[PDB]
Amino acid sequence: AKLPKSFVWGYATAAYQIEGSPDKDGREPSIWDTFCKAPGKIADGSSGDVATDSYNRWREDVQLLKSYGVKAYRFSLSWSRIIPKGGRSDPVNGAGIKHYRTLIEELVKEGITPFVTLYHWDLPQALDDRYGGWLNKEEAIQDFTNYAKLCFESFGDLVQNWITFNEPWVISVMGYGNGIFAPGHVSNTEPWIVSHHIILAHAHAVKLYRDEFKEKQGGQIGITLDSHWLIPYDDTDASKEATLRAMEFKLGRFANPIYKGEYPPRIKKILGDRLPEFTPEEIELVKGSSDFFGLNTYTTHLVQDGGSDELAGFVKTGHTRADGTQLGTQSDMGWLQTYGPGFRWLLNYLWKAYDKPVYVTENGFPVKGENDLPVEQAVDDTDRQAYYRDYTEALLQAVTEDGADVRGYFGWSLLDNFEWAEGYKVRFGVTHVDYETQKRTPKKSAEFLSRWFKEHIEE
Numbered sequence: 001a002k003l004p005k006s007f008v009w010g011y012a013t014a015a016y017q018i019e020g021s022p023d024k025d026g027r028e029p030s031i032w033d034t035f036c037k038a039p040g041k042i043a044d045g046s047s048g049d050v051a052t053d054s055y056n057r058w059r060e061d062v063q064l065l066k067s068y069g070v071k072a073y074r075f076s077l078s079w080s081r082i083i084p085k086g087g088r089s090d091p092v093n094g095a096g097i098k099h100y101r102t103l104i105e106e107l108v109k110e111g112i113t114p115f116v117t118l119y120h121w122d123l124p125q126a127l128d129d130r131y132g133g134w135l136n137k138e139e140a141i142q143d144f145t146n147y148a149k150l151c152f153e154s155f156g157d158l159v160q161n162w163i164t165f166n167e168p169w170v171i172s173v174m175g176y177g178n179g180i181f182a183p184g185h186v187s188n189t190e191p192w193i194v195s196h197h198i199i200l201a202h203a204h205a206v207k208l209y210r211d212e213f214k215e216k217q218g219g220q221i222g223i224t225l226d227s228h229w230l231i232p233y234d235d236t237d238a239s240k241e242a243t244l245r246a247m248e249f250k251l252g253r254f255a256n257p258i259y260k261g262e263y264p265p266r267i268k269k270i271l272g273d274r275l276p277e278f279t280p281e282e283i284e285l286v287k288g289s290s291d292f293f294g295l296n297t298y299t300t301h302l303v304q305d306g307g308s309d310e311l312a313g314f315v316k317t318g319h320t321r322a323d324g325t326q327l328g329t330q331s332d333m334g335w336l337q338t339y340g341p342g343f344r345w346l347l348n349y350l351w352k353a354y355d356k357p358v359y360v361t362e363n364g365f366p367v368k369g370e371n372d373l374p375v376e377q378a379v380d381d382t383d384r385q386a387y388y389r390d391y392t393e394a395l396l397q398a399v400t401e402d403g404a405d406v407r408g409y410f411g412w413s414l415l416d417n418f419e420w421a422e423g424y425k426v427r428f429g430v431t432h433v434d435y436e437t438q439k440r441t442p443k444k445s446a447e448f449l450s451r452w453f454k455e456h457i458e459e
């Protein structure tokens with residue numbers, strides 16, 4: 001069985017996670033630059049000051065992608081490189097724009113389709129200081145829309161695949177709910193407000209795209225949402241209901257508004273006044289505001305009722321069944337275990353629920369303890385190859401067999417990189433990086449994926 005010729009595959013990265021050169025060519029700080037200077041926030045006390053030095057080694061990264069035979073490449077734009085201070089009235093940075101324009105043109109020359117994420121968490125710090133970023137409704141919406149417009153104008157004739165936001169669930173929960181990610185806020189209200197404003201900022205950017213650029217540039221625009229596949233801990237009504245509630249707090253609170261036109265029932269009932277209400281005009285704007293369903297997924301979880309964390313929807317999630325059996329192979333992060341079947345079930349679920357072509361914008365695995373391995377051992381990344389073997393198979397079945405409309409798959413990540421609060425200790429690349437020399441060494445998983453997609457995409 002083979003995926004249609006139109007299917008695209010490749011790898012994904014995020015600007016702050018790989019670029020480095022934090023103040024080069026006019027770039028000003030993002031909230032993540034600030035966050036990494038706060039003690040105790042990053043596990044290994046690192047930052048994205050250097051990362052994989054991909055801002056400078058952008059050419060090398062493109063050659064690497066080409067050598068892998070990818071059909072596409074997903075990367076994000078550092079907002080503070082394009083508009084350093086971020087605002088609609090702030091000075092635009094020609095050098096930053098040119099950098100990305102040149103990168104995209106190299107991708108075009110190499111025949112690699114660019115998938116561009118406008119926002120992958122690096123909000124310009126000036127906006128946070130000016131009005132609290134996403135916390136301010138009208139300022140955040142106008143500035144993001146202006147930023148999106150500038151991006152469409154600057155790269156739109158070469159880019160036909162846009163992603164507004166990368167995981168608003170993470171942006172809101174981790175950044176404003178428990179303070180684990182930048183800007184490190186902790187509140188039972190801000191996460192819901194930030195989420196609301198992002199849904200609106202997203203919708204404004206999409207309407208702008210469709211109305212002023214889509215016809216001439218012939219592209220599409222969507223949002224990337226994260227979601228694991230969730231399975232009831234047992235077959236009791238409490239567990240089944242808890243699973244549905246968990247899906248709402250993770251995915252439904254974003255997908256139902258954007259694809260169906262309203263916030264789901266449970267969360268509104270639970271959060272009450274803390275969950276903002278869309279006005280009739282906002283609902284209209286938001287409903288149907290995504291051309292394709294961008295999905296980032298990594299594992300499967302068992303769900304039980306009785307959780308005490310409101311950010312999770314008052315449920316308990318884990319990878320340990322009632323009989324003690326684990327879902328799958330352990331990775332470097334406790335919550336993430338290998339479970340291919342869940343990927344297949346999730347793809348079908350999403351296609352049926354939201355009726356938009358699915359693009360898996362992220363899927364990968366961090367080999368447990370790989371950071372301690374020398375390059376010659378790290379390249380034999382057995383567990384990562386097994387993960388991709390299981391997940392690509394789930395993908396093949398979902399489309400060709402089950403009938404789920406899935407049109408893209410991007411592996412996270414092209415390179416080992418800065419894994420946010422975990423620092424550099426968690427390795428997700430199909431390519432090993434020696435941070436002391438910046439030398440790139442392909443791991444065996446890279447050979448597996450190149451070979452698998454070559455053999456499973458119609459010629």
Ligand SMILES: O=C1O[C@H](CO)[C@@H](O)[C@H](O)[C@H]1O
Nearest residue numbers: 014166226296362412419428
């Ligand atoms: O979903 C994700 O998982 C990746 C691995 O945790 C992380 O590096 C990306 O920034 C994030 O988008």
